Amino acid sequence: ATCDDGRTTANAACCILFPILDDIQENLFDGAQCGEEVHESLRLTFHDAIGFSPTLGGGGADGSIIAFDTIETNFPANAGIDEIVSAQKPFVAKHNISAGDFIQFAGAVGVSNCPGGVRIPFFLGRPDAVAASPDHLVPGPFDSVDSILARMGDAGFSPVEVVWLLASHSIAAADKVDPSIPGTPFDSTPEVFDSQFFIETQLKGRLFPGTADNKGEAQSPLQGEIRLQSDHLLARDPQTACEWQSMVNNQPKIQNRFAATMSKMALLGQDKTKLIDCSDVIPTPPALVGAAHLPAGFSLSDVEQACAATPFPAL
């Protein structure tokens, strides 16, 4: 199909996304940058989608975190999410797509601004949410590995899919974990979607970048990085450590698995065969240019190797 402005897309119903793409890139992502607003919109896709429990309810990726923001932004695991919900709500009011479609579309358009990124498959047509998420369904950084794996498993993700989705923390920072140092990233390249997150969480912890006593925070290996306790333990736990190390210096696997598992997450609560594929509307991301590496001056002796089957790669 050819849209009114001459841009093409495989399914004509997808044309309504083009003005929305332009508005988002200009006015949500500040001129298509891979910066805070993209990182916050990617976090929003997961805090929306993960509100899905077979035994309790919630409609998954349904826009409920915007539609029922008064409720869901009260949940402590949604701390800081109110800023991006407030930023996105007027786009939803202005355009003619549901909040659940908008959240997944904005997250996919944002990831496409980041070098190394992928185009996450994107489907159009989610109905408006009809219920708020239940409470207590979003994992937090102080939760055990078994707790996080049980919650994610209850929403349909295996432990390896958990590790694949946490490639998101390659373009990510924390504002509430240590409020003295907001914006401190989880890897050294928070504007590049790459394997540095899986490398750097494997280093021995050395210091706290801000204060020392924050719930959910582990020691970091670098003054300009923060480390969540959840990530510290997942990189080391026998249930997930081999998969975590398998992502290091493995950008093709990060790309393929993140796109696929993001698509699975964007469809929680939904039925792909009822929606229209509009994947080809997402921009083409830039590619990586620089090789994966340990931080300069570090060596294998600084890595806490946690996979008995396979030594950490010589980078």
Q: Which residues are the active-site residues? A: 47, 164
Nearer to Ca ion, 78 or 189 (CB): 189
Nearer to Ca ion, 51 or 141 (CB): 51
Nearer to ligand HEM, 170 or 246 (CB): 170
Q: Is 36 in the site for ligand HEM (CB under 6 A)?
A: yes
Which among 306, 278, 227 has a CA at the least distance from the CA of 124?
278
Residue of the chain from 28, 103, 172, 268 that contacts ligand HEM (CB under 6 A)? 172
Q: Which stretch binds Ca ion (CB under 5 A): 35-43, 88-96, 181-189, 287-295?
A: 181-189
Q: Which stretch binds ligand HEM (CB under 6 A): 4-12, 165-173, 191-199, 240-248?
A: 165-173
117 binds, among Ca ion, ligand HEM, none (CB under 5 to 8 A by kind): none
Non-local CB neighbours of 235 within 8 Å, separated by 6+ positions:
198, 201, 202, 241, 244, 245, 304, 306
Q: Is 225 in the site for Ca ion (CB under 5 A)?
A: no
At position 195, the amino acid (one-letter code) is: S
Q: Is 168 in the site for ligand HEM (CB under 6 A)?
A: yes
Nearer to Ca ion, 166 or 303 (CB): 166
Residue of the chain from 14, 24, 28, 42 that contacts ligand HEM (CB under 6 A)? 42
Cite the annotated binding site for heme b by residue number.
169, 173-177
The full DSSP string for 199-232 is: HHTTBPP-B-SS-S--TTEE-BSSTT--EEHHHH
Residue of the chain from 9, 25, 45, 220 that contacts ligand HEM (CB under 6 A)? 45
Which among 186, 256, 254 has a CA at the least distance from the CA of 220?
186
Query: Which residues 205-244 are close enough to bind ligand HEM by CB under 6 A?
Result: 216, 228, 230
Q: Is 267 in the site for ligand HEM (CB under 6 A)?
A: no
Nearer to ligand HEM, 111 or 132 (CB): 111
303 binds, among Ca ion, ligand HEM, none (CB under 5 to 8 A by kind): none
Query: Which residues 12-51 are close enough to bind Ca ion by CB under 5 A?
Result: 48, 51
Rounded distance between C-alpha atoms, residue 308 and residue 62, angstroms: 41
Give the torsion sign (CA, 14, 121, 183, 291): negative
Residue of the chain from 9, 41, 45, 64 that contacts Ca ion (CB under 5 A)? 64
Q: Is 148 in the site for ligand HEM (CB under 6 A)?
A: yes
Q: Is 174 in the site for ligand HEM (CB under 6 A)?
A: yes
Q: Is 187 in the site for ligand HEM (CB under 6 A)?
A: no
Rounded distance between C-alpha atoms, residue 63 and residue 53, angstroms: 16
Rounded distance between C-alpha atoms, residue 147 and residue 94, angstroms: 39
In the complex, which residues of this chain contact ligand HEM (CB under 6 A)? 36, 39-40, 42-43, 45-46, 80, 139-141, 148, 162, 165-166, 168-169, 171-177, 216, 228, 230
